[PDB]
Ligand binder design. Structure first.
Ligand SMILES: CSc1nc(-c2cccc(NC(=O)c3cc(O)ccc3F)c2)c(-c2ccnc(NC(C)=O)c2)[nH]1
Ligand SMILES: CSc1nc(-c2cccc(NC(=O)c3cc(O)ccc3F)c2)c(-c2ccnc(NC(C)=O)c2)[nH]1
Ligand SMILES: [Cl-]
Lengths: 314, 302
């Protein structure tokens, strides 16, 4: 209750469209505290309608859980406004989502960065599992970039709260992430922490291919059919077999045979200490992590919260 | 000092966008920092300093900026970056609320007692840190206290007066007569700063010529008791304005006294009607959006 602020329409205004997604439309907004004349920039996500007749109460009940997460790699829901539409408010991060970032820096992202992103994403998911929360829609598009050295997972639980209409699960490119889903989730709508591990594997594939679309050209209606016959996402050219084997274990049919998020943290952090042994990238060396000076600059301006330190090289 | 705490910016990676204000030390701009290889523009605050009385060496300007970048305290502004061209430009975090002097004036009819007493607590905490680092401000005033949130203020521009080279009505008498600047003379200006807050931004010795302040202090005259101040508050202010600098209070004793008074604020400030400190919900909203650095909890009422 003390973690979630209930906003009124009178104290915030949408001032710029930022993008649209499977869950709603993102705006750059301004919050005016009562009695003040300043405008604080915020981020606002106006959600699509739900398929269920959800009352406000329990919409607020899931928002209370969204506002209760405390981890450097999980987005905390800061505020909510229940008007005609449901509007979620969080801190504005000028870098956007990680999927767009790797697409904008495809020839300039080094190994140290890619491996550290996989560590931080697994750290966030491991926290969500500790909170016994299942994301259901983990993907690079749902990873937000606070700084290039600090990423955070967002939109956990929005898939279960909003839901998706039955026709989308059998349509092409709908509000259903078929190409990120575990097979048990496609066949029987079973969502666990272990199906999150599957989507984590696809998310890592997204980063290592610098934002390539998974199963591109393959119809979503045939994904369960090709997965049943043993076909998986191909090995990215920069990935050694050690990295590719990790991805393949998250896509195992037996959900309990997939790795745990706490074991994914350990394995990727060991690889981050010696990044050029596990990722082969052209000119990888001159793609350093930032100096102490510049990160101290990044942190003082944009990231005054504390996080783990990014895993350094040998 | 770790040189790693001061980033030297170049003109191409930052550009001024809007004037925010002017002072005796320079002009304040709202700026945007564009990181190299980044398509983002981060809002910053930029202070371009005016010409120094006597022209200092570039090493010295750079040597003192390293000290300004070395302070680590929730109530002292840390210098984040500098750009040394023809002019000197200082870069710090952008704070949308501005200075405490304008804030207390704009809320002349809205300010509650817990804000005023806690602001005094925080200013003394910032000054005590500067005293611990043996840095002398020389120009502590309400205009030089910045508002990050209404519950969080920070001191700025320490040492700029000595680098650039006159607030007569904020200075201790030893500073007027002989230009003696100590942590003790900073205590004098702290009292005037508190008097500013308790009068909601009133000008000290308004209508009195600055050239006559030296005589008015020597005959024992001081700033009057603010209408909302009980004598406990006013006695603290008068003790910082004692002629004997060694008899003035120390910043560590000002922290304790104002924190005691903040625990029962309406027993020490008599205000007609203002607004209390924010809920836990509104406090974490302010901080999750705007203020994520480490602070001690603001002193609440018993
Ligand atoms: C790529 S999609 C996207 N959505 C968002 C967004 C916006 C507002 C709120 C939320 N979410 C939650 O509040 C929430 C939901 C839950 O279920 C669990 C927990 C929660 F906290 C998300 C962004 C985003 C956020 C901030 N700044 C930017 N900046 C730029 C340049 O785009 C974008 N981007
Ligand atoms: C007194 S007027 C004023 N100056 C500044 C300012 C701006 C940039 C740099 C500095 N200087 C220092 O940071 C510095 C100086 C030192 O010597 C020691 C250590 C230091 F950190 C100051 C502001 C200010 C700052 C941020 N946001 C706002 N927002 C609004 C709405 O006005 C204003 N206001
Ligand atoms: Cl100034």
């Amino acid at each position: 209750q003390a973690l979630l602020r209930i906003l009124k329409e009178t104290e915030f205004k949408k001032i710029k469209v930022l993008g649209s997604g499977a869950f709603g439309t993102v705006y750059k907004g301004l919050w005016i505290p009562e009695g003040e004349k300043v405008k604080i920039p915020v981020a606002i996500k106006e959600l699509r309608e739900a398929t269920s007749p959800k009352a406000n109460k329990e919409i607020l009940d899931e928002a209370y859980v969204m506002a209760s997460v405390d981890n450097p790699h999980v987005c905390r829901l800061l505020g909510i406004c229940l008007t005609s539409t449901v509007q979620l408010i969080m801190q504005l991060m000028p870098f956007g989502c990680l999927l767009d970032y790797v697409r904008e820096h495809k020839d300039n992202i080094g190994s140290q960065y890619l491996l550290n992103w996989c560590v931080q994403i697994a750290k966030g998911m491991n926290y969500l599992e500790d909170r016994r929360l299942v994301h259901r829609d983990l993907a690079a598009r749902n990873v937000l970039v606070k700084t290039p050295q600090h990423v955070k997972i967002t939109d956990f639980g929005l898939a279960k709260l909003l839901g998706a209409e039955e026709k989308e699960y059998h349509a092409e490119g709908g509000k259903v992430p078929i190409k990120w889903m575990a097979l048990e989730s496609i066949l029987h709508r079973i969502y666990t922490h272990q199906s999150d591990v599957w989507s984590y594997g696809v998310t890592v594939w997204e980063l290592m291919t610098f934002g390539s679309k998974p199963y591109d050209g393959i119809p979503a209606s045939e994904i369960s059919s090709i997965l049943e016959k043993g076909e998986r996402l191909p090995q990215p050219p920069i990935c050694t077999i050690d990295v590719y084997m990790i991805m393949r274990k998250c896509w195992m049919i037996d959900a309990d045979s997939r790795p745990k998020f706490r074991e994914l943290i350990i394995e990727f952090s060991k690889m981050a200490r010696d990044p050029q042994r596990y990722l082969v990238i052209q000119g990888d060396e001159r793609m350093h992590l930032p100096s102490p000076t510049d990160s101290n600059f990044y942190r003082a301006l944009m990231d005054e919260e504390d996080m783990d330190d990014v895993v350094d090289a040998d």
